[PDB]
Ligand binder design. Sequence first.
Ligand SMILES: [Zn+2]
Ligand SMILES: [Zn+2]
Ligand SMILES: [Zn+2]
Lengths: 233, 75
Amino acid sequence: HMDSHYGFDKAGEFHMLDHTGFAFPSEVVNGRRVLKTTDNNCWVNVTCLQLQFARFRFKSAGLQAMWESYCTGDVAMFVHWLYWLTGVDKGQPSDSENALNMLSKYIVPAGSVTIERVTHDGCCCSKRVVTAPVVNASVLKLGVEDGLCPHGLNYIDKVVVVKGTTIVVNVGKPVVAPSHLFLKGVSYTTFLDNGVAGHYTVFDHDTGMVHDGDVFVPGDLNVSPVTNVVVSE
Amino acid sequence: MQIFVKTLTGKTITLEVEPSDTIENVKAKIQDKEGIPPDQQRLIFAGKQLEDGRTLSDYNIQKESTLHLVLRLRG
Ligand SMILES: [Zn+2]
Ligand SMILES: [Zn+2]
Ligand SMILES: [Zn+2]
């Protein structure tokens, strides 16, 4: 029952635990619900922000009831579940792109992406239509190398057609590039190396500002190291 | 069989694996060659994140396939 009502394994074990320790102070900013920066929770803030920018749902009605409570202020349960699923200890930093990939199988697919595979001089070509909540591809219009073709030339994987909304997680280090080279998206998570810690933050393309914790700081997409983007059409 | 793994710098190393091997075994071979602990490793194939508990045959990883390595960020 517990595993069918909420849609994930060991659901009975989780729901008996105490979620109060993860009730971070939160506010509403530009309609989005964001978390105040504390206990290195920035990876949780930017992870749940992309779920809001993507307008994603969860497959089971039980998990969505948890996610809906997160957006209304009851952030204790879902935040704990992100630590419980990803296997991260409270107060410790984590990877937001790793969290989104583990969340993908629980999210209803709300979009589509065509990934074209071609080489340096069009020697071998193929197209496929991906329909997943999170797809690991290049956040740039360039693409990434993906091995050799039967002619000894490197493949290139780029997103050419976008339907609906999906989260494209970059396959590599945080990339800085001109804004007009990224895929057309609505929000970009950036990752700054402060010197061995890091700071996660989201860039709202509409307002042209940046979600930083519970505030709204200025930012420039041209100098932001993007790690994943909520691509839309 | 042999597979290729694109690393952090852009160079491509080759691994000697079996279709019955698990992803944790592939991460152990990357640690044994690049010195990166599997706790900092993320393997992507065909745009999908590879689970630790599954085998290469579960992801239909054929002979001479290419995986992408990306370091886990600490935010
Ligand atoms: Zn029920
Ligand atoms: Zn070719
Ligand atoms: Zn083509």
